[PDB]
Design a binder for this molecule. Structure first.
Ligand code: HXA
Ligand code: LNL
Ligand code: LNL
Ligand code: OAA
Ligand code: ZN
Ligand code: ZN
Ligand code: ZN
Ligand code: ZN
Ligand code: ZN
Ligand code: ZN
Length: 183
């Protein structure tokens, strides 16, 4: 809970909160059952009204079209859209992106790493189970996490990842404020 490292993470979360649009790439390793059966995605996101369109790997089927429209999270199988979940129902079920950052322990500045041609500050930390459950409802312990924060003046959250017991989730941002067509 180093105040300087926490401050730097808050800078990236505030930058994230201020985005009009962003491209998100989700990747996983091992076994992750907490993303409604999705294990990979590349998704264009519009922040307000929240809307998303892209592609995902769902139940091991690749190239599955993916959308968020209104309250619905949906995937297209063959010619048919089906709803995997509801935003409101997940929001009450699991419990904006300012998690209780106090609660985050053992912040460590690991130095500089280049991701997609961007120099980033790598900071590791430990996330309390209560916050981990928001991502993985079955989580029973505090888990290690990592964030990579651009050093270019933007404070972009270029990447964030969490090592869950059974697997890991990695989220990579790009295309900040580049226009998207999501409907
Ligand atoms: C090592 C310390 C870990 C601290 C916790 C890191 C939190 C990671 C948050 C994930 C990044 C957000 C997902 C990308 C989608 C961005 C769309 C913008 C809408 C969010 C606006 C809002 O929060 O109200
Ligand atoms: C890309 C894979 C999608 C799987 C997502 C399922 C779990 C997500 C983790 C917590 C969900 C937070 C719900 C969002 C809060 C409401 C946002 C809003 O209404 O603007
Ligand atoms: C420290 C945490 C690192 C893992 C990041 C979480 C990964 C995946 C869940 C977050 C949702 C990604 C955004 C996808 C579009 C937003 C609409 C939605 O699916 O809820
Ligand atoms: O919404 C999606 O991502 C898929 C849709 O069928 C398209 O326009 O290709
Ligand atoms: Zn310090
Ligand atoms: Zn992509
Ligand atoms: Zn995109
Ligand atoms: Zn059909
Ligand atoms: Zn789980
Ligand atoms: Zn930006």
């Amino acid at each position: 809970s180093d105040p300087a490292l926490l401050a730097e993470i808050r800078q990236s979360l505030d930058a994230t909160k201020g985005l009009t649009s962003v491209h998100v790439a989700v990747r996983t390793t091992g076994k992750v059952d907490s993303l409604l059966g999705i294990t990979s995605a590349d998704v264009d996101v519009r922040a307000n009204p929240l809307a998303a369109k892209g592609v995902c790997t769902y139940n091991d089927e690749q190239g599955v079209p993916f959308r968020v429209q209104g309250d619905n999270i949906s995937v297209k199988l063959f010619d048919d859209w089906s709803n995997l979940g509801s935003i409101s129902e997940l929001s009450t079920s699991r419990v904006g992106v300012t998690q209780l950052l106090s609660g985050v322990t053992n912040l460590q500045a690991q130095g500089t790493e280049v991701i997609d041609g961007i120099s980033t500050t790598k900071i590791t930390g430990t996330i309390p189970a209560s916050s981990v459950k928001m991502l993985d409802p079955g989580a029973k312990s505090a888990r290690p996490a990592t964030v990579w924060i651009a050093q270019d003046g933007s404070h972009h959250l270029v990447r964030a990842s969490i090592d869950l017991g059974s697997g890991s989730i990695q989220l990579t941002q790009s295309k900040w404020n580049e226009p998207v067509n999501v409907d």
